[PDB]
């Protein structure tokens, strides 16, 4: 998932 992703977590460090 985007949240457990690196880049997608970077971008979405909100959710995660």
Coordinates of N, CA and C in Angstrom, one line a residue:
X1 N 0.8 -1.2 0.0 CA 0.0 0.0 0.0 C 0.8 1.2 0.0
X2 N 0.2 2.3 -0.5 CA 0.9 3.6 -0.6 C 1.5 4.1 0.8
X3 N 0.8 3.7 1.8 CA 1.3 4.1 3.1 C 2.4 3.2 3.6
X4 N 2.5 2.0 3.2 CA 3.6 1.1 3.6 C 4.7 1.1 2.5
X5 N 4.4 1.9 1.5 CA 5.4 2.1 0.4 C 6.4 3.1 0.9
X6 N 7.5 3.3 0.2 CA 8.5 4.3 0.5 C 8.2 5.7 0.0
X7 N 8.1 5.7 -1.3 CA 7.8 6.9 -2.1 C 6.4 7.4 -1.9
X8 N 5.5 6.4 -1.9 CA 4.1 6.7 -1.7 C 3.9 7.1 -0.3
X9 N 4.8 6.7 0.6 CA 4.6 7.0 2.0 C 5.2 8.4 2.3
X10 N 6.2 8.7 1.4 CA 6.9 9.9 1.5 C 5.9 11.0 1.2
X11 N 5.3 10.7 0.1 CA 4.2 11.6 -0.5 C 3.0 11.6 0.5
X12 N 2.7 10.4 0.9 CA 1.5 10.1 1.8 C 2.0 9.7 3.2
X13 N 2.7 10.6 3.9 CA 3.2 10.4 5.2 C 2.2 10.9 6.2
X14 N 1.0 11.0 5.7 CA -0.2 11.6 6.4 C -0.9 10.4 6.9
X15 N -1.3 9.6 5.9 CA -2.1 8.4 6.1 C -1.3 7.4 7.0
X16 N 0.0 7.3 6.6 CA 0.9 6.4 7.3 C 1.8 7.3 8.2

